[PDB]
Every structure is written in structure tokens, then in C-alpha cells.
């Protein structure tokens, strides 16, 4: 049961780490998309200029 | 035998609470978020590249490979969850079938003469997931595959359902698809296509034609069928073609004006 | 930015199935601990009997 | 995020509760079987 | 047998109450799924 508690704790830790990593990857993709949209706004403003 | 540790025991109501609590981690939300992210990334990439810049084929191939891998992973996850549900159902049925240990049945199980279902052995014996009855074909995959041809030229005939080589033998004879409708001289603001007609319409004059008639024949040739307003669905291909055509005409006008002024 | 976003798409594709391996390792070795919990639940009842 | 967390925890809790309902139904079926065995014993005692 | 019968009676009453709560919770969770979907749409609008 102490081994089960350690196994449940490590599985929850791995689930939290995997979810945090995938959420951070999704947020990094969102930030990259935002940076690309900002660069597109800069590009369209440069095209307007 | 020896140390009294039986291989397996019949399920108990207290054990049943934990069995009910146990579940596969659900990734459906994560898969939907990943699919939305990749789809929006493809949509951003469609107009991100400079119209003058050419050579997007490798990026399109890489994204297609990533999408195919994601689809395979999603199919494997569906197989995993369905296998988990089937294993749980089989285990609960087997546990219900098996008798309960009270005085000596536990001793018989410990001696190994009596056997009870074990989730670990059933999970090890569970058949490996198979990507069967899964077709990796989506609207996003189709638009991603066809966007390089649209980038090369607005009018193309990529589908080869009628014949693998081309639309007909070696000669397409398909003419060109015009962004400007002959009925309405404007770009398609609302490109809608029917699943049966397979033709894109602006819907500005199509709604008026459908008004007063429950079903109307498709105005375009090469088909004979009647469809309602609800049959039409959004077609991203037509809007992508219109956007790329606008970007190319704008860039060519800018370049020609700049070159002419530089000459003077 | 397109190279970075394609690298991020490759990284998220690599995280895909890694999350599945984490899910499989979370469900696996947890059924064994659940069996150990069932063994303890049966054990307390049988020892009391 | 608070609403999503509350929804996920509620969904897990209600799934566990539904499984608790089905196991309680199984336990009641077992109790009814035990009651039927007890009624058979009562009928044998009554005939004796 | 009467003690077993009253135990079954309370257990089945609890099962019925739990089933009614489960039906209401399913309706409320569908409402919460719509609520979180509209909140997510509002979050996307706010973020854009």
C-alpha cells in the first residue's frame, strides 16, 4: 500500500508533468502564433509604407 | 504455497470502489486542442509565406507527416480506451462469476488449486492496438495536400477519384475555375459546396433561386440533382484560392510599379 | 519563425504518443497496485474472519 | 480555468458515483440472493 | 431477515436517490459543458 501510494504519487506527478509540458508547448505555439501575427502586422504595415 | 500470498482474489465492494474510480487518462480534450493548434498553424502558414517566396513543398510535407502521425496516435488512443473499457467489463464479469472466499476458499486460492482473474495478466494478454477501420482523410489534410498546387496556380484538378492518373485518362479537359461568378461579378465571400453537387457557389443569388422552390436543379453542368439550402457547407479551398490570387496580383502590381520607377 | 513553428510542431508530435506512453504507464502498474489494494481489502476481512 | 477544473472534477466524481450506483445495485442483488437463501431456510424451518 | 430487508430498503432508497441525483447531475453537467464552451469562446474573444 505504501508502494501503491508512491506509485499513485509518481503517476500523478508524471500526469501533471505531461499535462504541464503539453500546455506549455500549446502556450509556446500560441506565443509563436502571436509573434508570427505581430510580424505579419509589421509586414503589412511595411507593405502599406 | 510457502508465504501465504495468493496470486489473485475475488473483487470486494471496497475494492469495487477503487475499480470504479480507476479509469484511463482522457486525452480527447488534448487531442482536440492539438488538432485545433495544427489546423490554425496550417491556416496561418497558408498566408504567412511571402507570395514571391517559393519552395514551401518541404514544409507542407513535414506538416502532412506530423498530421498523419497525430491521426495514428489518435486512432491508437481510441483503441487504448476501448480496450481498457472491454478489459474492465471482462474483469468485472469474471470477478462476479468467481465465488467469494470466507473460511477455506482463501486457503485453496493460496495453494494455487483455485484461480481468480488478475487485471495485470489480462492487460499483458490484451491484444496490441491496431489502426484498423481508420481513414486518415480530413478536410484539413485535403487542403494541406492541395495548397502547393493552388500556390503554383489558382486553377488545378488534384482529385483523382474518377481515374488514378487524371480526371480522364491523361487529359484533364477541366478548363479553369473562376473566382468571379458569371452570375455575380464579385469574389465568393461565402463559398458553400454541396456534398452531392460538389460545386462551390457564392449563395448570394443561390438563396434567391432556392426561394419559393423546395428543391432546384444545380445550375452547373456535369451533374443532375436537386439540393436544399441546408445541404451546402463551408468550402475553405475556394477562399484559399481567392486569397492567394489576391496576394499574387497585389505583389505583381507592387513589383512592376517599383521596377518601372527604379528604371526612371 | 516558420522553421521554429515547424520544429515546435515536430516537438508537439514527439510529445504526442509520449503522452500516450505516460497514460499507458499510468494505467499499467496502477492495476497491479489496485490488485494489491484488493488483496489488502480481502486480507483484512479474511484475517478478521 | 476554475470552471474547467470544477467541471472535470465533477465529471470524474459523477462517473465514480454512477459506478458506485451500479456496484450498490450489484451489492443489493447479492443481498437479495442472500435474503432468498434465508427465505428458503425459513421455508425449510417452517415445513420442519 | 428483517434487518437484511431494511438494509436492502435503505440501500435501494439510496440507489434511487443517487440515480435521481445522477440524472439531474447529467443535465447540469451538459449545462456546465455548454457554460464552459461559451466561457472558452468568451476567453478566445477576450484573448483576440
Curated annotation (Swiss-Prot), chain A:
- Modified how: Sumoylated by MMS21.
Cystine connections: none
Assembly with partners or alone: Component of the Smc5-Smc6 complex which consists of KRE29, MMS21, NSE1, NSE3, NSE4, NSE5, SMC5 and SMC6.
The UniProt similarity line reads: Belongs to the SMC family. SMC5 subfamily.
Which compartments does it reside in?
Answer: Nucleus; Chromosome
Misc remark: Present with 892 molecules/cell in log phase SD medium.
- Summarize the protein's role: Acts in a DNA repair pathway for removal of UV-induced DNA damage that is distinct from classical nucleotide excision repair and in repair of ionizing radiation damage. Functions in homologous recombination repair of DNA double strand breaks and in recovery of stalled replication forks.
- For this entry, the protein name equals Structural maintenance of chromosomes protein 5
Q: What is known of its domains?
A: The flexible hinge domain, which separates the large intramolecular coiled coil regions, allows the heterotypic interaction with the corresponding domain of smc6, forming a V-shaped heterodimer.
From Swiss-Prot, chain B:
Q: What pathway is this protein said to act in by its record? A: Protein modification; protein sumoylation
Which GO molecular function annotation, any one, does this entry have?
protein serine/threonine kinase inhibitor activity
The record's Gene Ontology biological-process terms are: chromatin looping; DNA double-strand break attachment to nuclear envelope; DNA repair; double-strand break repair via homologous recombination; protein sumoylation; regulation of telomere maintenance
Other comments on record: Present with 2800 molecules/cell in log phase SD medium.
Q: Which InterPro entries match?
A: MMS21_N, Nse2(Mms21), Znf_MIZ, Znf_RING/FYVE/PHD
Q: What does this protein do?
A: Acts as an E3 ligase mediating SUMO/Smt3 attachment to SMC5 and YKU70. Acts in a DNA repair pathway for removal of UV-induced DNA damage that is distinct from classical nucleotide excision repair and in repair of ionizing radiation damage. Functions in homologous recombination repair of DNA double strand breaks and in recovery of stalled replication forks.
* Keyword field: Cytoplasm, DNA damage, DNA recombination, DNA repair, Metal-binding, Nucleus, Transferase, Ubl conjugation pathway, Zinc, Zinc-finger
What PANTHER family does its record include? E3 SUMO-PROTEIN LIGASE NSE2
Q: Check the record and name the CDD domains matching this protein.
A: SPL-RING_NSE2
Q: Which family does it belong to?
A: Belongs to the NSE2 family.
Q: What class of enzyme is it?
A: transferase
Residues that hold Zn(2+) according to the record: 197, 199, 218, 223
Q: What Pfam families does this protein map onto?
A: MMS21_N, zf-Nse
DNA repair: present as a keyword of the record?
A: yes
- Compartmental location: Nucleus; Cytoplasm
ZnF bounds (SP-RING-type): 166-253
Query: Can you name the source organism?
Result: Saccharomyces cerevisiae (strain ATCC 204508 / S288c) (Baker's yeast)
Gene Ontology CC = chromosome, telomeric region; cytoplasm; nuclear envelope; nucleus; Smc5-Smc6 complex
Q: Could you describe the subunit structure of this protein? A: Component of the Smc5-Smc6 complex which consists of KRE29, NSE1, NSE2/MMS21, NSE3, NSE4, NSE5, SMC5 and SMC6.
Specify the protein name: E3 SUMO-protein ligase MMS21
Q: EC number(s)?
A: 2.3.2.-
Swiss-Prot record, chain E:
Where in or outside the cell it occurs: the entry states: Nucleus; Chromosome
Description of its domains = The flexible hinge domain, which separates the large intramolecular coiled coil regions, allows the heterotypic interaction with the corresponding domain of SMC5, forming a V-shaped heterodimer.
Q: According to its UniProt record, which protein family does this protein belong to?
A: Belongs to the SMC family. SMC6 subfamily.
The annotated subunit structure for this chain is: Component of the Smc5-Smc6 complex which consists of KRE29, MMS21, NSE1, NSE3, NSE4, NSE5, SMC5 and SMC6.
Additional note from the record: Present with 339 molecules/cell in log phase SD medium.
Function (record text): Acts in a DNA repair pathway for removal of UV-induced DNA damage that is distinct from classical nucleotide excision repair and in repair of ionizing radiation damage. Functions in homologous recombination repair of DNA double strand breaks and in recovery of stalled replication forks. Probably plays a role in structure.
UniProt-recorded name of the protein: Structural maintenance of chromosomes protein 6
Give the originating organism. Saccharomyces cerevisiae (strain ATCC 204508 / S288c)
Its encoding gene is what?
SMC6
The part of the entire sequence present here spans 337 to 384 of 1114
Amino acid at each position: 500500500v505504501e508502494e501503491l501510494t508512491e506509485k499513485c504519487s509518481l503517476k500523478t506527478d508524471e500526469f501533471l508533468k505531461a499535462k504541464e509540458k503539453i500546455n506549455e508547448i500549446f502556450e509556446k505555439l500560441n506565443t509563436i502564433r502571436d509573434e508570427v501575427i505581430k510580424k505579419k502586422n509589421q509586414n503589412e504595415y511595411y507593405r502599406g509604407r | 504455497n510457502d508465504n501465504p500470498i495468493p496470486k489473485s482474489v475475488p473483487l470486494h465492494p471496497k475494492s469495487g470502489k477503487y475499480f470504479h474510480n480507476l479509469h484511463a487518462r482522457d486525452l480527447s480534450n488534448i487531442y482536440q486542442q492539438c488538432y485545433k493548434q495544427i489546423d490554425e498553424t496550417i491556416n496561418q502558414l497558408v498566408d504567412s509565406t511571402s507570395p514571391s517566396t517559393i519552395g514551401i513543398e518541404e514544409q507542407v510535407a513535414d506538416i502532412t507527416s506530423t498530421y498523419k502521425l497525430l491521426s495514428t496516435y489518435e486512432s491508437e488512443s481510441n483503441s487504448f480506451d476501448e480496450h481498457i473499457k472491454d478489459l474492465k467489463k471482462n474483469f468485472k464479469q469474471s470477478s462476479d462469476a468467481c465465488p467469494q472466499i470466507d473460511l477455506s476458499t482463501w486457503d485453496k486460492y493460496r495453494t494455487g488449486e483455485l484461480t481468480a482473474p488478475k487485471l495485470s495478466e489480462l492487460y499483458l494478454n490484451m491484444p496490441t492496438p491496431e489502426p484498423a477501420t481508420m481513414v486518415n482523410n480530413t478536410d484539413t489534410l485535403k487542403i494541406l495536400k492541395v495548397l502547393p498546387y493552388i500556390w503554383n496556380d489558382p486553377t488545378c484538378v488534384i482529385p483523382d477519384l474518377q481515374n488514378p492518373a487524371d480526371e480522364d485518362d491523361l487529359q484533364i479537359e477541366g478548363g479553369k475555375i473562376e473566382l468571379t461568378c458569371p452570375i455575380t461579378c464579385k469574389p465568393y465571400e461565402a463559398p458553400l459546396i454541396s456534398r452531392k453537387c460538389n460545386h462551390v457557389f457564392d449563395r448570394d443569388g443561390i438563396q434567391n433561386y432556392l426561394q419559393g422552390y423546395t428543391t432546384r436543379d444545380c445550375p452547373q453542368a456535369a451533374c443532375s440533382q436537386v439540393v436544399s439550402m441546408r445541404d451546402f457547407v463551408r468550402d475553405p479551398i475556394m477562399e484559399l484560392r481567392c486569397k492567394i490570387a489576391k496576394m499574387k496580383e497585389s505583389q505583381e502590381q507592387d513589383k512592376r510599379s517599383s521596377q518601372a520607377i527604379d528604371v526612371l | 519563425l516558420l522553421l521554429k513553428q515547424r520544429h515546435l510542431l515536430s516537438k508537439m508530435a514527439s510529445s504526442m504518443k509520449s503522452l500516450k506512453n505516460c497514460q499507458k504507464e499510468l494505467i499499467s502498474t496502477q492495476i497491479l497496485q489496485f490488485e494489491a489494494q484488493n488483496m489488502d481489502v480481502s486480507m483484512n476481512d479474511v484475517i478478521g474472519f | 480555468v476554475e470552471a474547467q477544473d470544477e467541471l472535470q472534477q465533477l465529471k470524474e466524481d459523477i462517473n465514480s458515483r454512477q459506478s458506485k450506483i451500479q456496484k450498490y445495485k450489484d451489492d443489493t442483488i447479492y443481498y437479495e440472493d442472500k435474503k432468498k437463501v434465508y427465505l428458503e431456510n425459513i421455508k425449510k424451518i417452517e415445513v420442519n | 431477515v428483517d434487518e437484511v430487508t431494511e438494509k436492502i430498503r435503505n440501500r435501494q432508497e439510496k440507489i434511487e436517490r443517487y440515480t435521481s441525483d445522477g440524472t439531474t447531475i447529467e443535465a447540469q453537467i451538459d449545462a456546465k459543458v455548454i457554460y464552459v464552451n461559451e466561457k472558452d469562446s468568451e476567453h478566445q474573444n477576450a484573448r483576440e
